[PDB]
Symmetry: C2
């Protein structure tokens, strides 16, 4: 049975960190829902790429649960994720059901805002470290991808393929991840 991913897309998201995981997960046969935080309307990303979500977050929530909830980064997108009561509820539920949560660059700082996964090892974008580490609630890692159980984090646009393939491996296994990787022409 196909695994399912919820990608939460907010204004100011890093569009590479949104599209690379969506695309790679779809390549892996994951059913991905790109859900707009603000509603069904197009989303203006950090570098002005405009992406049309598959559904509003409100609607996508009623179609869960999901095998992974994915938080792209970009500072302004991550702040919108961090400010959202809807995101808080989705992440709390996901953590309560022992489901994977994956966040990249500034995205992990929404985990802090929502009090998710304290006591985990995490990475972030280097520039987001101090924000993430306020209070000492996580242990910091400089690995390009960090996975501490059900909290999977990564650093930036240039780690997005590694992030996405780590999600694929966690859901669908190593062999699927390797099969998906080869046609991408990664170094």
């Amino acid at each position: 049975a196909s695994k399912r991913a919820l990608v939460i897309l907010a204004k100011g998201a890093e569009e590479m960190e949104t599209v690379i995981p969506v695309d790679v997960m779809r390549r892996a046969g994951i059913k991905v829902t790109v859900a707009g935080l603000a509603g069904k309307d197009p989303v203006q990303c950090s570098r002005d790429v405009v992406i049309c979500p598959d559904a509003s977050l409100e609607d996508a929530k009623k179609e869960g649960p999901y095998d992974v909830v994915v938080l792209p980064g970009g500072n302004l997108g991550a702040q919108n994720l961090s400010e959202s009561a809807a995101v808080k509820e989705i992440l709390k539920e996901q953590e309560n059901r022992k489901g994977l949560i994956a966040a990249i660059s500034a995205g992990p700082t929404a985990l802090l805002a929502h009090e998710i996964g304290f006591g985990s090892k995490v990475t972030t974008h280097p520039l987001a470290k101090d924000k993430m580490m306020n209070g000492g609630h996580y242990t910091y890692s400089e690995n390009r991808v960090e996975k501490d159980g059900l909290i999977l984090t990564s650093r930036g646009p240039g780690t997005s393929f590694e992030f996405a393939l780590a999600i694929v491996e966690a859901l669908n296994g190593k062999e699927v991840a390797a099969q998906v990787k080869a046609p991408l022409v990664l170094k």
Copy 2:
């Protein structure tokens, strides 16, 4: 004065190969126009990411010329590029004015279709090699990025950062490219 890039976006384009160059070029201070081949409406990419173009190709053409014309890949997107009389004219004009043309994965096969850049060294996605090489009009390279003068080619989603940074270097220079690269957290 800011350099300008035209990114031609067709149905079935590889969305990573579209978004990574747009984003990286904008990071470099390039004025990028995402132009929809079919018009102004949203474009459904190969892995179902839906991108809203900045303008129709028809409108974007009247705002040229551009310092680079960029052709994303994806087989179906590249075929739509290859079938377009509008793309033929834009590429012919660009070649005639000695402007850069950049194409990735299947994208270079639109250069073949439009008879652009014959006698150049090129790369493509490995699966697109035989199509590109029909007739022997180019010399094939397995470099991740190939640049033979004003024809700049690359291989796949996993070479898109290298492709984009090569465009940045060609337009804005090595130092800008290095400055843009560092915050991306590339390996």
